[PDB]
Design a protein around this ligand. Structure first.
Ligand SMILES: [Mg+2]
Ligand code: NA
Length: 346
DNA sequence: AAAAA
DNA sequence: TTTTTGC
DNA sequence: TTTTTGC
DNA sequence: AAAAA
């Protein structure tokens, strides 16, 4: 019935097991900070498989037949079926390491290692951190502190629609033939997001594309609507977290009047530039979710003896690179039924 | 993957 | 070298 | 038991 | 922490 793979389950934003998944998300994040990568992912898969259920769990008889639920997970569910609360998750939420890790990493530029550095030093608040002379923050870390309250108050659908109008007009100006598609959470029909993602491709000067990202940003800097900027340069690809595509991580100023206190709002924007021939691979890889993508790869590997990434799909048996002009072709190659963006919310 | 430190 | 960034 | 768990 | 080899 139900598959252990996120790519073989239709997961919508209509969750009936929110009580359970919230508890499991906390328990995963707890093993994330302790670097217990195996345990972390176990709770990530249990929480993911539950978000796919077309009904709410009311009894233990309901869990039977559902994969990714072993002893530990079935007990979390057992604990919630009665109380209506998780004693495991309510414990983690009241832990100093966790509270501080969750807090510190919520800053743009701060991750696992820096949060652990600050916590070991004896820090617990972002205020005592900011008011220290002995410390030295990066260009990401300074921007993260500067626009904290605005980046922490996650983006909304009208705000994302204002950004997508601004990004398209600026990209359309320096390149008119280019197709610009909004990726990430907002492509999967989300209402709230941490950031706004985009994919840029034009059907195509090898020299012109390389200037595209710089053309649109410098143009936004001339208007002074570019608060933060960082650009990155562009077979059988593996052990590479982020793809080999040209890309940029920005913080842009969104004037209140463009979206239908101070008159502004800092918004996190990710732009990705890829060759036209890779459009399908890039879109699939940037739509997400995290759990859908990692399972797409895990499926290809373990079930199809193939190699999936954001650039291509390689069949090891037939020793050929399977091309695609759409997402539907990549799914068909993998022998997976099509799961449209809105149902990739794993 | 790149780019900062 | 080590850290951060992304779905 | 030992290995894998996403690029 | 769970499932496969
Ligand atoms: Mg996003
Ligand atoms: Na961060």
């Amino acid at each position: 019935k139900i598959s252990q793979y996120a790519c073989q389950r239709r997961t919508t934003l209509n969750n009936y097991n929110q009580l359970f998944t919230d508890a499991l998300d906390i328990l995963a994040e707890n093993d994330e900070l302790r670097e217990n990568e195996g345990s972390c992912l176990a709770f990530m898969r249990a929480s993911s498989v539950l978000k796919s259920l077309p009904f709410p769990i009311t009894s233990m008889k309901d869990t039977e037949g559902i994969p990714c639920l072993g002893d530990k997970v079935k007990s979390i569910i057992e604990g919630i079926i009665e109380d209506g609360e998780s004693s495991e998750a309510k414990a983690v939420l009241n832990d100093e390491r966790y509270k501080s890790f969750k807090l510190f990493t919520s800053v743009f530029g701060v991750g696992l290692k820096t949060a652990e550095k600050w916590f070991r030093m004896g820090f617990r608040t972002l205020s005592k951190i900011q008011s220290d002379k002995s410390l030295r923050f990066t260009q990401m870390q300074k921007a993260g502190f500067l626009y904290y309250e605005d980046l922490v108050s996650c983006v909304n659908r009208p705000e994302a629609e204002a950004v997508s109008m601004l990004v398209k007009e600026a990209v359309v100006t320096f390149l008119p033939d280019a197709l610009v598609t909004m990726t990430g959470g907002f492509r999967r029909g989300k209402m709230t997001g941490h950031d706004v993602d985009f994919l840029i491709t034009s059907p195509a000067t090898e020299d012109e594309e390389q200037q595209l990202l710089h053309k649109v940003t410098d143009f936004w800097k001339q208007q002074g609507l570019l608060l933060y900027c960082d650009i990155l340069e562009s077979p059988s690809r593996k052990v590479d977290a982020l793809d080999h595509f040209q890309k940029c991580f920005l913080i842009l100023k969104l004037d209140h009047g463009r979206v239908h206190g101070k008159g502004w709002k800092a918004i996190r924007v990710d732009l990705v530039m890829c060759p036209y021939d890779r459009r399908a691979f890039a879109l699939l890889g940037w739509t997400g979710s995290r759990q859908f993508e990692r399972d797409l790869r895990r499926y290809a590997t373990h079930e199809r003896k193939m190699m999936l990434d954001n650039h291509a799909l390689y069949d090891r048996t037939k020793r050929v690179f399977l091309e695609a002009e759409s997402e539907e072709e990549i799914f068909a190659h993998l022998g997976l039924d099509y799961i449209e963006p809105w149902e990739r919310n794993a």
